[PDB]
Design a protein around this ligand. Structure first.
Ligand SMILES: Nc1nc2c(ncn2[C@@H]2O[C@H](COP(=O)(O)CP(=O)(O)OP(=O)(O)O)[C@@H](O)[C@H]2O)c(=O)[nH]1
Ligand SMILES: Nc1nc2c(ncn2[C@@H]2O[C@H](COP(=O)(O)CP(=O)(O)OP(=O)(O)O)[C@@H](O)[C@H]2O)c(=O)[nH]1
Ligand SMILES: Nc1nc2c(ncn2[C@@H]2O[C@H](COP(=O)(O)OP(=O)(O)OP(=O)(O)O)[C@@H](O)[C@H]2O)c(=O)[nH]1
Ligand SMILES: Nc1nc2c(ncn2[C@@H]2O[C@H](COP(=O)(O)OP(=O)(O)OP(=O)(O)O)[C@@H](O)[C@H]2O)c(=O)[nH]1
Ligand SMILES: [Mg+2]
Ligand SMILES: [Mg+2]
Ligand SMILES: [Mg+2]
Ligand SMILES: [Mg+2]
Lengths: 428, 426, 428, 426
């Protein structure tokens, strides 16, 4: 049992899903048709004689992206009714995503979700992929979250949010969308793993030696993180970790559930033969600011909770020693009210290699989930961004005309402020 | 006569238990699917302590395998030697506790308990004479800690006079594989306090150290570590399973080693811990074994016996020896450095000598110490609890499962009391 | 354990390193790829299945020289991130090396250094190669030295400085660069081994019979000295010597740590068959002014400390007798406050022969490290050179414009004067 | 009965010690990995003096091997005969002292000491009757000099009545393999003064001379030199390991040869020093041996006994002899040229005669002299110290490790006092 279902919302959600599912297929020896040539049960169902099918749902208020899915390399992996499309997009308008356009499609997707749940025996949770800056990825996601809360108040819900750094912003109204949606997210999410594009880009240039990263490139890395996360559910280990565990171990306080995921080692085909790939070495890499997937100012804050998910050939003793060493380093700071900061998980599967990929085959790998106070700074900058725009009512007409009232914005701002204050408090 | 029930709860228990079964089967000449390959009448004589015997002379452990997470069960069966277990003794829930003690103890544990209870009753009524129970589990996780203790409680209600043994792995300060270990440990240890006759405290850190520095191994796996534990387990019960010159069952040790009801936490040690390249340069003998057993390095619990005192020690020796020699060694140990032996208990050493040594080595010793140094272990945990509880960190999850602040306070208080008691007698 | 790491700074530093590393590879049976076909562990790490990699770091504020390294015979020996380049050079301006341009690259190299340290188990020290006359080799080196002091105050740091004699000067502002850097060097170096180009040239013409020495030629000899120095660390001997020993045995007083290295025998392929290569003979050669690697006026001063590192087939008794004989000679003078002047070290490895080389295979060899008062004269001449130039503020504009103040120069001069005085004093 | 602990510290000690072990094993018929190839019951009888005996009749030295520099340890193991040593008796630090006595004595030595101490305790408690200790090391280097003396001190604290022996190599004026030898020697000799029962002073120069002029060898290696030392070592303890006609253990010699506590520095000599081509032209006999032993050429310490006087001499002879002959020779030596024998001690000669000669030769002698001429050795060193100390040369390194000027002053003073005492009795 223990099955888990993926929900992909908006363009970002879809394209990430594309990579992820591809990766999964390669991992379990599933060809792009669906035949194999159990462990995988947690992500793939079976029907017919030999064909395997993703427990996944793709949602977009526009057909463009999902049309490519329908007519691509993986057209035969998905039954057509797990792809929902067809309409006008929430044109980077949270309100449209949430009120006008979300209203028309919600029931269909919810039915699908229910069906998927019913197919399975006692699934643990949901993995939700989206951006904060998109009208669909913002407005619709919140609505969906609400629905999920209503249906299964008990069950775990994890998300992968594509978070915008102000210097690499591609959309004008990113601040409004992010703030409104984040408030809604707050009450119904168990934890949200933030990813920053800029950081990814940086990683690509420095550690993969690629000057010109495409979106396609970026997504691969993200997929690997996902794989690392859920490998313990899919495979036999020495020491295991589940979705329930993460919630337990990362959230000191209800409101403070926004941790950063980092990954290592990230190596080109060339650099590996001059690389002593150590357990300690990768751990070390994990706590160096250049390897963060969110640009956050990590050294200024303190760490509250840290999960280290190793995969490949590992000696637990060595891991322990590495951890000890890390603890002993002075500059890295944990909160004084938590002496013991690391949840450790081990997995016997070596991470996989994508045909035509950027990443070298490695024998030891690690994904760290880490919660730091420093991430509050990101919110502060976002709030600052919001505050000036709000001041002149810039772009407000678009939102008001979509059945969203003005005091709502104010409320959201207040909430964000309170959240920020909270981080400041808990760091003492 | 003198028949035992084994129970394994949570991941650690299940794996350790498996290892134990492999060992003891090997000792008594039993093959994995194979019925019998034993070399001696002695082995045959006391098979009925741990095993049952179906038609055509098959054999099956009186073992129960429990977990809220289905996966580990799968692993256990999938291993070689997995066909020996009766399929009706696999009793698993649907979703794991996820290191939430409360879940282990209320929501899923309660749902699980009835089947377990029924199987235990079945096991009891089947056999003529019931001696005791052996539970293997952790204090750091949700299932082993929470559900296990519930199970124990239930057992106690049923049979008040029977023996309760637990082999409990313990948290260590530098290495924490879960952030909520202080809470988990605290809650479960409280529960243990009231319902167990003897509890064997085991640390991973210590085991690692042993593997690294004594056995001179660069790459310790969990299996290797578990091996030591298995050996220890085997050693404890050798008196029930073989004729010796001096015999000491579970009850005997318990009576000998517990001066006050509360103080029933035993620190095991084992000898000889030899390395592969290093073994041929030792004369195998009583005195050497004795010397090894009282080194701080060979305490499986990560506490220094130098900073406390022994109330009592039990020594179980396997292979042929001169009892006189053993006694003289004991005397030497006592008189020479009586600095760490309590004055009011005159002779602090208990001896059992069993004729049949383990497979591999010719003479071996298991040491079971009731040391006041164990308070140190509890102290750190208490401190950590205090640190967490002041900020109310991670309380919310526990609250969500029925728990309330008062329980935490009470358990901590109890722990403190226990600590104080140990100190007083030191 | 006992590993040691090489740092190459500026052009001189790089090219010396090139030869040295080549020599090392030949010595340990390492082909130019990295496979072998332990002892060597102190200089080479291992990663992968069979590949060995230099614990070396190459630094240059300009890509020119290190680009050749990247695309040469030894391209595959170094991982690309142990070579740091790319920018405008310190155009023979100490200030640029130290202030403007050093500032931008320092962190990257320091990180690399730290990584290298972490890879190893308890490395003893660092070997730093550079010139004094280069803007990079002067200004940057001091900065790097500072960093090293900050990080590892305890550990040993040895240097190979290419020192300029006034008659063979190739750069106009050699005096300023040398003086400024030397002051900085003073506090953070355990000992600095001076090499003079002119002396090398002389040696080449007389004892190798080559009229036209190239820089490439010169470096080979230098590499041999280095090998002689560190062979005791890399190999089994009869009597051994380490980096710690040198510091102990050569430095009577904190400030006086500038000894000269000499080497013998230096023989063409032809001259060897008419050569009775004696232990005594080579010792004798060692104390003859024509064999000095610095032009210093050796007979005028006194010797304070002398280390003799023999390698090849040696009878210790013979060495002892040679030493005694040397002592008995009247003209060679030791300081009256040290009766016993020689540290003696023996190594079972015959020194190696470079394919296409100038040097004959020999069965006995020696490298002498010797500290003499005479070297103070060199500083005096340098100071004289400086003093006239300073007098007219010649070339001062370049330095002042790079964030260096004028009184600094004066201070440096004062320091040098004091140092000179000190040598004069200790020689009494 | 009468069992000994061997210790080797620093490079010299380790190599010399190895040689010694090779020799003594050869003598008692022990092979490198091979358990036993001995030809005689006698050899068997007293194996337990220097060895332990594991299962299947294996044998292992009660030897401890110590160094701050890992490399030498590697060399020792890598040699043939390296498999005989128990791997737990290899106790090395991480980084070498680098001829800084202070480092040897404080920073790394202190870190190293505990493991060594534990092993020595283990060795002691293992065996019924503990006789003494034998340390091989230098006074010129950082580890052998600094750490060694610390170790000795520690040992003294533990067992005040047990015998301390040291075989100490000494600095020579013309040949110095380190420039800081005066300091190193001074500091260590002070330490020796208070904690050793007998110290054997050995010079490299003398050894070289012997190899060149007496053995007529052109190419002496360190191994060859070490051989003599090994032989000497073997000779000293022959009374413990074999039945003789007259027997003298470590204690006996000590009592016989030390008139005042302070004056316990013995100059060893050995006979016969024969060459390869030259041996067939000698009648092997007592008188010749005696004549050889009292030549200045065969003093292993580079001092001229012509410029001092003997307080006492011990003569240990191996092979069958006429005791009477030996005694008469001794008498002849004494009466003829009593010019260098102290009047107040009437008979200055001690004799021990052991029946089993070394492998190779039929009769042999070891001579151990307490001569006032030893003051000369100290004097030069003192002078050198004075020369250095006036200019404060190389003081800074020592300061950097905790040392202070006062210590140097005190040690020098002590040395001076010692020198004076020797003179007075001359
Ligand atoms: N001695 C051993 N200890 C182990 C082993 N595996 C895990 N552990 C320890 O047990 C602790 C947690 O125990 P479990 O893995 O059984 C988790 P548990 O089943 O008790 O509850 P859940 O986490 O809710 O499943 C963990 O923190 C480790 O320190 C093992 O093979 N041997
Ligand atoms: N009789 C022997 N003497 C030796 C031998 N090797 C070295 N020596 C002498 O020992 C002196 C230094 O001793 P070591 O080599 O053991 C250096 P030590 O370990 O004592 O301290 P560090 O120098 O800090 O390592 C040196 O000055 C030589 O005169 C040997 O094989 N035999
Ligand atoms: N990591 C990642 N981010 C993406 C990708 N495509 C778009 N984004 C980000 O998502 C935001 C744009 O919103 P979309 O994800 O297109 O939102 P949507 O839900 O499709 O709704 P619209 O943008 O209104 O069509 C920007 O912040 C982009 O940086 C992708 O392939 N990978
Ligand atoms: N021995 C030796 N000396 C060299 C070599 N190349 C340059 N030099 C000397 O180095 C000094 C010039 O400085 P560089 O080493 O070029 O200095 P840099 O650090 O590269 O900085 P710039 O000179 O400003 O490029 C002169 O004194 C040269 O004689 C070489 O291959 N071997
Ligand atoms: Mg879109
Ligand atoms: Mg579990
Ligand atoms: Mg240049
Ligand atoms: Mg040494």
């Amino acid at each position: 049992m223990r099955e888990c279902i993926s929900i992909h919302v908006g363009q970002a959600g879809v394209q990430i899903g594309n990579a992820c599912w591809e990766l999964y297929c390669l991992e379990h020896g599933i060809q792009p048709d669906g035949q194999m040539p159990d462990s995988f049960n947690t992500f793939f169902s079976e029907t017919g004689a030999g064909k395997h099918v993703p427990r996944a749902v793709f949602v977009d208020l526009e057909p463009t992206v999902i049309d490519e899915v329908r007519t691509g390399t993986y057209r035969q992996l998905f039954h057509p009714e797990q792809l929902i499309t067809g309409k006008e997009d929430a044109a980077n308008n949270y309100a449209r995503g949430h009120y006008t356009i979300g209203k028309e499609i919600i029931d269909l997707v919810l039915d699908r979700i229910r069906k998927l749940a019913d197919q399975c025996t006692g699934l643990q949770g949901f993995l939700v992929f989206h951006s904060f800056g998109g009208g669909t990825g913002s407005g619709f996601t919140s609505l969906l979250m609400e629905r999920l809360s209503v249906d299964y108040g008990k069950k775990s819900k994890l998300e992968f949010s594509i978070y915008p750094a102000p210097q690499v912003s591609t959309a004008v109204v990113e601040p409004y969308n992010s703030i409104l949606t984040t408030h809604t997210t707050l009450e119904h999410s168990d934890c949200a793993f933030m990813v920053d594009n800029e950081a990814i880009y940086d990683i690509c240039r420095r550690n993969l030696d690629i000057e010109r990263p495409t979106y396609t490139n970026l997504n691969r890395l993200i997929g690997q993180i996902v794989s690392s996360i859920t490998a313990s559910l899919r495979f036999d280990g020495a020491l295991n970790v589940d979705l329930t565990e993460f919630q337990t171990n990362l959230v000191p306080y209800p409101r403070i559930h926004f941790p950063l995921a980092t990954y290592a080692p990230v190596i080109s085909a060339e650099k590996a033969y001059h690389e002593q790939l150590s357990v300690a070495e990768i751990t070390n890499a994990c706590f160096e600011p250049a390897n963060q997937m969110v640009k956050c100012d990590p050294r200024h804050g303190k760490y509250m909770a840290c999960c280290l998910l190793y995969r490949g050939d590992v000696v637990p003793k060595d891991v322990n020693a590495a951890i000890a060493t890390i603890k002993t380093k002075r500059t890295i700071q944990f909160v004084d009210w938590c002496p013991t900061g690391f949840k450790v998980g081990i997995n016997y599967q070596p991470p996989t290699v994508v045909p035509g990929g950027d990443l070298a085959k490695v024998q030891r790998a690690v994904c760290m989930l880490s919660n730091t106070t420093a991430i509050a700074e990101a919110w502060a900058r976002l709030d600052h961004k919001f505050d000036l725009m709000y001041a002149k009512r810039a772009f407000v007409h678009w939102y008001v005309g979509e059945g969203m009232e003005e005091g709502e914005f104010s409320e959201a701002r207040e909430d964000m402020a309170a959240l920020e204050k909270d981080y400041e408090e808990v760091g003492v | 006569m003198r028949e035992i029930v084994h129970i394994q709860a949570g991941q650690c228990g299940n794996q350790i238990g498996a290892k134990f079964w492999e060992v003891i089967s090997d000792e008594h000449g039993i093959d994995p699917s194979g019925n019998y390959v034993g070399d001696s009448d002695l082995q045959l004589e006391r098979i009925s302590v741990y095993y049952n015997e179906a038609s055509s002379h098959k054999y099956v452990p009186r073992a129960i395998l429990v977990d809220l997470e289905p996966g580990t069960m799968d692993s256990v069966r999938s291993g070689a030697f997995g066909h020996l277990f009766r399929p009706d003794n696999f009793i698993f829930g649907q979703s794991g506790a996820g290191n939430n003690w409360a879940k282990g103890h209320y929501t899923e544990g309660a749902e699980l308990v009835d089947s377990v209870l029924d199987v235990v009753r079945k096991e009891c009524e089947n056999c003529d004479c019931l001696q005791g129970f052996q539970l293997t589990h952790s204090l750091g996780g949700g299932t082993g800690s929470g559900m296990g203790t519930l199970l124990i409680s239930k057992v106690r209600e049923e049979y008040p006079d029977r023996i309760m043994n637990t082999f409990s792995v313990v948290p260590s300060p530098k290495v924490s594989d879960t952030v909520v270990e202080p809470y988990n440990a605290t809650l479960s240890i409280h529960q243990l306090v009231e319902n167990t006759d003897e509890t064997y405290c085991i640390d991973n850190e210590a085991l690692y150290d042993i593997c690294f520095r004594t056995l001179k191994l660069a790459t310790p796996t969990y299996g290797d570590l578990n091996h030591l534990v298995s050996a220890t387990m085997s050693g404890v019960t050798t008196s029930l399973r073989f004729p010796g010159q001096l015999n000491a069952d579970l009850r005997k040790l318990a009576v000998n080693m517990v001066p006050f009801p509360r103080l029933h936490f035993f620190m095991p040690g084992f000898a000889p811990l030899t390395a592969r390249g290093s073994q041929q340069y030792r004369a195998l003998t009583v005195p050497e074994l004795t010397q090894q057993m009282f080194d701080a390095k060979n305490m499986m619990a990560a506490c220094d016996p130098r900073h406390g005192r022994y109330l009592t020690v039990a020594t179980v020796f396997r292979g042929r020896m001169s009892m006189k020699e053993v006694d003289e060694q004991m005397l030497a140990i006592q008189s020479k450095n009586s600095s760490y032996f309590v004055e009011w208990i005159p002779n602090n050493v208990k001896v059992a000598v069993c004729d049949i040594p383990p497979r591999g080595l010719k003479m071996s010793s298991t040491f079971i110490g009731n040391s006041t140094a164990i308070q140190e272990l509890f102290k750190r945990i208490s401190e950590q609890f205090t640190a967490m509880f002041r900020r109310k960190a991670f309380l919310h999850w526990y609250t969500g499962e029925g728990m309330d602040e008062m329980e935490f306070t009470e358990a901590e208080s109890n722990m403190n009391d226990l600590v104080s008691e140990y100190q007083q007698y030191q």
